[PDB]
Amino acid sequence: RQDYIAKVRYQNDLPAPPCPPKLLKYEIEKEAPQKEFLKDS
Amino acid sequence: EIASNERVLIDHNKVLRGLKPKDFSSVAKDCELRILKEK
Amino acid sequence: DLMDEKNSIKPDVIEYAADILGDVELQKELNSEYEQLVSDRKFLREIVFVNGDHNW
Amino acid sequence: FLEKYVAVCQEENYPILPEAYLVLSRVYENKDLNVALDYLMKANDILGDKANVYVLNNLGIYHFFRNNVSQSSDFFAQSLEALNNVSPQNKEALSITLHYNKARVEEVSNQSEAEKLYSKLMEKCPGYTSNKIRYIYLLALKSNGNNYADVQQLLDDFPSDLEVRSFYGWFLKRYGRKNGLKQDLESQHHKDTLINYDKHDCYALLSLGNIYATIAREMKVTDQKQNEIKRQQYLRAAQFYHKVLSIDPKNIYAAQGIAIIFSDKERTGLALEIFKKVRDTVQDLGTFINLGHCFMEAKQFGKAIESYTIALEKFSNGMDSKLLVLIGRAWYHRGFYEKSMDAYKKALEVSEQAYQLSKLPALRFNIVFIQFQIADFVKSLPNTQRDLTTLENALSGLNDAIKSLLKLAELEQPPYPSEDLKARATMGSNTLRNQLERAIQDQQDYEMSIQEKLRTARRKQQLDE
Amino acid sequence: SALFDDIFTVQTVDNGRYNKVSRIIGISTTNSAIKLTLDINNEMFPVSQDDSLTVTLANSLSLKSWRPPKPTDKSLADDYDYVMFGTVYKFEEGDEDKIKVYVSFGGLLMCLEGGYKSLASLKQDNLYILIRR
């Protein structure tokens, strides 16, 4: 079958890991500061 | 201490959601009924 | 105008556009129609409605 | 409750605690980045000079996710400035984190400073993995995957790290044939990752599904048994994707693999629906290419042309030859199925541009085939539906196509056997060439008759006048 | 199934005289020179400026008296947030590639400007418009 030459290859390639910047937990995200803040007089 | 303080905004599975998530539950059901249950 | 191509009927609106150009009898008929129209225009514009009102 | 507290404090004119704002932003991180960022801004405004390093870092990350490069950079600079006030105990950790964030921002802006800060942090803390992963990834980008030893060493350093394993598997998928490694080696690595570390990791499941789909596609089909084995491999890949969807139904890549399997299984409608949903979700070059392929399989050639054009303009920027080949094929399909000459002209021009970009035997044969089809279609056309210019162009294209067919037949490994090329050139020259000249003569006779009628009418009109 | 598909970004939202009806103007992201002027119901599908809308036009919802839809049946409308049904009352075959399609969804008007190739198939008596966001 001498006709138009074309190659079909589906692209589903996974991207490389992004490694985005990491959020920093608040001081009130730790159990001990939470206890100190809630137990305030 | 770094690991404890580190927080990642989006999860490993949720990274494809980002700011706009979409549902393919119907797609999953159709795949189950037409691939795993394919005759 | 059946002689000039760009002043004729568009070819996509009529099936027979091929065998229309160059015909002289059909051009005579069209010329008679246009002369009748011009006579009507003159009669309406110079005798009946001189002020040009066309909604009657 | 936090909104009620905020409202009550506002009604009472009492100082709203910024801790409630931080908690609200933390909650909205998984719901609305906009509301979380707004609450963080309100908390920072309340604090004034009491702004901390974490608040500035989170504001910078919010603006980075919002693509506010200027504002993110300003917030990161303010965080680095405030780092001087950090307690010494956490100072080292927060400095490492801020330097990593700044290196990420540089990698967005300029990779050189990112690599410099990566080396700085690696000397500061060799145990960190993300820094090493990004540095080795940038090196592989610069070295075209010539640092496989570094990737293997990093994998050995953290065999239990999911990020390290995923990066190593990505590098394998990228350059396995370049490195000559085992085809199933990455499959065994991902199988070990799933069995011994985490069986719910969608990355390794998708990699295994892609490998199994590739194996099934490359498998030769000879009888029912081989087709059933291929279907079983596709079923394994589909089970990988279904487990991924069970883990997370919002996985675009699992649906894309499902659509590819359906394309192999000729379930065109489901693949088309999945690809449309994916395009609505995310827009990359692969999605547009797959949409064009599906439209070609769905016989919607115009939509395929549009999809390929959008893919070419948005991402490839008119440089890739494969997209031009796809556009030419779609145009040829449109011209053949719809009997349109302008489609053939556009396909010919696209093929000529692609060849001038590449000058490969495949595109030479494509041009020859297009010209032969053009000549055949023009000969098949009636006189009233064509003109002399198209006939002359078709004849010239036929001559050039015969010459290029001989050229291809004189090549070492032409896309088609040289005997077939020579036979086609001979067949075109023997009969089609003469039929083109006969059509040219008939067209000339038709034009002459038209002009004779036009010149005869005016003389009779003048005589009548 | 679907006769037209694109993604639009809302430039202007005009409430004007009415309370429940808004005019939105959008241009296609993948292809400029495609415009969409549309009436929508604010209370059911509220929109804001610079929103992204997935607009689809179909001649049928399949996959004469109207009936409330049974929960068991499934149709094309299950994937979208706002479906309207209207009649095409003008198909302006304008300049070289300027085609305008006027559609009236029971008095709520839509005009779609675009090239001939995109809007060739939109020469139907009635059209469904399916909007997702």
CSV table of all heavy atoms in Angstrom, one decimal, chain C residues 13-33:
chain,number,residue,atom,x,y,z
C,13,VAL,N,-26.0,30.2,-7.6
C,13,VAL,CA,-27.4,30.3,-7.3
C,13,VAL,C,-28.3,29.6,-8.4
C,13,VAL,O,-29.5,29.3,-8.2
C,13,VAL,CB,-27.9,31.7,-7.2
C,13,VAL,CG1,-27.1,32.4,-6.1
C,13,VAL,CG2,-27.8,32.5,-8.5
C,14,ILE,N,-27.7,29.4,-9.6
C,14,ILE,CA,-28.4,28.8,-10.7
C,14,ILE,C,-27.7,27.5,-11.2
C,14,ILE,O,-26.5,27.5,-11.2
C,14,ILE,CB,-28.7,29.8,-11.9
C,14,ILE,CG1,-27.4,30.5,-12.2
C,14,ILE,CG2,-29.7,30.8,-11.5
C,14,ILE,CD1,-27.5,31.4,-13.4
C,15,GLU,N,-28.4,26.5,-11.6
C,15,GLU,CA,-27.8,25.3,-12.1
C,15,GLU,C,-27.3,25.5,-13.5
C,15,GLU,O,-26.2,24.9,-13.8
C,15,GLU,CB,-28.9,24.1,-12.1
C,15,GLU,CG,-29.4,23.8,-10.7
C,15,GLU,CD,-30.5,22.7,-10.8
C,15,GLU,OE1,-31.1,22.5,-11.9
C,15,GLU,OE2,-30.7,22.0,-9.8
C,16,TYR,N,-27.9,26.3,-14.3
C,16,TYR,CA,-27.6,26.4,-15.7
C,16,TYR,C,-26.7,27.6,-16.0
C,16,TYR,O,-26.7,28.1,-17.1
C,16,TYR,CB,-28.9,26.6,-16.5
C,16,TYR,CG,-29.8,27.6,-15.9
C,16,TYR,CD1,-29.7,28.9,-16.2
C,16,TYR,CD2,-30.9,27.2,-15.1
C,16,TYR,CE1,-30.5,29.9,-15.6
C,16,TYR,CE2,-31.7,28.1,-14.5
C,16,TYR,CZ,-31.5,29.5,-14.8
C,16,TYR,OH,-32.3,30.4,-14.2
C,17,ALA,N,-25.8,28.0,-15.1
C,17,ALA,CA,-25.0,29.1,-15.3
C,17,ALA,C,-23.9,28.9,-16.4
C,17,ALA,O,-23.4,29.9,-16.9
C,17,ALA,CB,-24.2,29.5,-14.0
C,18,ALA,N,-23.7,27.7,-16.8
C,18,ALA,CA,-22.7,27.5,-17.9
C,18,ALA,C,-23.2,28.0,-19.2
C,18,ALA,O,-22.5,28.7,-19.9
C,18,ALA,CB,-22.4,26.0,-17.9
C,19,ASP,N,-24.4,27.6,-19.6
C,19,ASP,CA,-24.9,27.9,-20.9
C,19,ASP,C,-25.8,29.2,-20.9
C,19,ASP,O,-26.8,29.3,-21.7
C,19,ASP,CB,-25.7,26.7,-21.5
C,19,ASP,CG,-26.8,26.3,-20.6
C,19,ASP,OD1,-26.9,26.8,-19.4
C,19,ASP,OD2,-27.7,25.5,-21.0
C,20,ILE,N,-25.5,30.2,-20.1
C,20,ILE,CA,-26.2,31.4,-20.1
C,20,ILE,C,-25.3,32.5,-20.7
C,20,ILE,O,-25.8,33.3,-21.6
C,20,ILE,CB,-26.5,31.8,-18.6
C,20,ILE,CG1,-27.7,31.0,-18.1
C,20,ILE,CG2,-26.9,33.3,-18.6
C,20,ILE,CD1,-28.9,31.1,-18.9
C,21,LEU,N,-24.0,32.6,-20.4
C,21,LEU,CA,-23.2,33.7,-20.9
C,21,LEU,C,-23.1,33.6,-22.4
C,21,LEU,O,-22.9,32.5,-23.0
C,21,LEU,CB,-21.8,33.7,-20.3
C,21,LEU,CG,-21.6,34.5,-19.0
C,21,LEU,CD1,-22.3,33.9,-17.8
C,21,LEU,CD2,-20.1,34.7,-18.7
C,22,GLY,N,-23.2,34.7,-23.1
C,22,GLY,CA,-23.0,34.8,-24.5
C,22,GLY,C,-24.3,34.6,-25.3
C,22,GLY,O,-24.3,34.8,-26.5
C,23,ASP,N,-25.4,34.3,-24.6
C,23,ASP,CA,-26.7,34.2,-25.3
C,23,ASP,C,-27.3,35.6,-25.6
C,23,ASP,O,-27.2,36.5,-24.8
C,23,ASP,CB,-27.7,33.4,-24.5
C,23,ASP,CG,-28.9,32.9,-25.3
C,23,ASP,OD1,-29.2,33.4,-26.3
C,23,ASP,OD2,-29.4,31.8,-24.8
C,24,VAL,N,-27.8,35.8,-26.8
C,24,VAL,CA,-28.2,37.1,-27.3
C,24,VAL,C,-29.8,37.3,-27.2
C,24,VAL,O,-30.2,38.4,-26.8
C,24,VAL,CB,-27.7,37.4,-28.7
C,24,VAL,CG1,-28.4,36.4,-29.7
C,24,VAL,CG2,-28.0,38.8,-29.1
C,25,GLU,N,-30.5,36.2,-27.5
C,25,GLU,CA,-32.0,36.3,-27.3
C,25,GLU,C,-32.4,36.5,-25.9
C,25,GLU,O,-33.3,37.3,-25.6
C,25,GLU,CB,-32.6,35.0,-27.9
C,25,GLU,CG,-34.1,35.2,-28.2
C,25,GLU,CD,-34.9,35.0,-26.9
C,25,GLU,OE1,-34.5,34.3,-26.0
C,25,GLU,OE2,-36.1,35.5,-26.8
C,26,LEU,N,-31.8,35.8,-25.0
C,26,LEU,CA,-32.1,36.0,-23.6
C,26,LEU,C,-31.7,37.3,-23.1
C,26,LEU,O,-32.3,38.0,-22.3
C,26,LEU,CB,-31.4,34.9,-22.7
C,26,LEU,CG,-31.7,34.8,-21.3
C,26,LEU,CD1,-33.2,34.5,-21.1
C,26,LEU,CD2,-30.9,33.7,-20.6
C,27,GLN,N,-30.6,37.9,-23.6
C,27,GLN,CA,-30.2,39.3,-23.4
C,27,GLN,C,-31.2,40.2,-23.9
C,27,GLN,O,-31.5,41.3,-23.2
C,27,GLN,CB,-28.8,39.6,-24.0
C,27,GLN,CG,-28.3,41.0,-23.6
C,27,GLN,CD,-28.2,41.2,-22.1
C,27,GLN,OE1,-27.7,40.3,-21.4
C,27,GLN,NE2,-28.7,42.3,-21.7
C,28,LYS,N,-31.8,39.9,-25.0
C,28,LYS,CA,-32.9,40.8,-25.5
C,28,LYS,C,-34.1,40.8,-24.6
C,28,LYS,O,-34.7,41.9,-24.3
C,28,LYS,CB,-33.4,40.3,-26.9
C,28,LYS,CG,-32.4,40.5,-28.0
C,28,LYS,CD,-32.3,42.0,-28.4
C,28,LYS,CE,-33.6,42.4,-29.1
C,28,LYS,NZ,-33.7,41.8,-30.5
C,29,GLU,N,-34.5,39.6,-24.1
C,29,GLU,CA,-35.5,39.5,-23.1
C,29,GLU,C,-35.2,40.4,-21.8
C,29,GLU,O,-36.1,41.1,-21.3
C,29,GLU,CB,-35.8,38.1,-22.7
C,29,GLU,CG,-36.3,37.3,-23.9
C,29,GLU,CD,-37.7,37.7,-24.4
C,29,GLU,OE1,-38.5,38.1,-23.5
C,29,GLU,OE2,-37.9,37.6,-25.6
C,30,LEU,N,-34.0,40.2,-21.3
C,30,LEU,CA,-33.6,40.9,-20.1
C,30,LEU,C,-33.6,42.5,-20.4
C,30,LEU,O,-34.0,43.2,-19.5
C,30,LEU,CB,-32.2,40.5,-19.7
C,30,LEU,CG,-32.2,39.1,-19.2
C,30,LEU,CD1,-30.8,38.7,-18.7
C,30,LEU,CD2,-33.2,38.9,-18.0
C,31,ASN,N,-33.2,42.9,-21.6
C,31,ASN,CA,-33.2,44.3,-21.9
C,31,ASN,C,-34.6,44.8,-22.0
C,31,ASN,O,-34.9,45.9,-21.5
C,31,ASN,CB,-32.5,44.5,-23.2
C,31,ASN,CG,-31.0,44.6,-23.1
C,31,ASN,OD1,-30.3,43.7,-23.6
C,31,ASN,ND2,-30.5,45.6,-22.3
C,32,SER,N,-35.6,44.0,-22.5
C,32,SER,CA,-37.0,44.5,-22.5
C,32,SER,C,-37.5,44.6,-21.1
C,32,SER,O,-38.2,45.6,-20.8
C,32,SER,CB,-37.8,43.5,-23.3
C,32,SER,OG,-38.2,42.4,-22.4
C,33,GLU,N,-37.1,43.7,-20.2
C,33,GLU,CA,-37.5,43.8,-18.8
C,33,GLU,C,-37.0,45.0,-18.2
C,33,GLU,O,-37.7,45.8,-17.5
C,33,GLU,CB,-37.1,42.6,-18.0
C,33,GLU,CG,-37.4,42.6,-16.5
C,33,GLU,CD,-36.6,41.6,-15.7
C,33,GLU,OE1,-35.7,41.0,-16.3
C,33,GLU,OE2,-36.8,41.5,-14.5
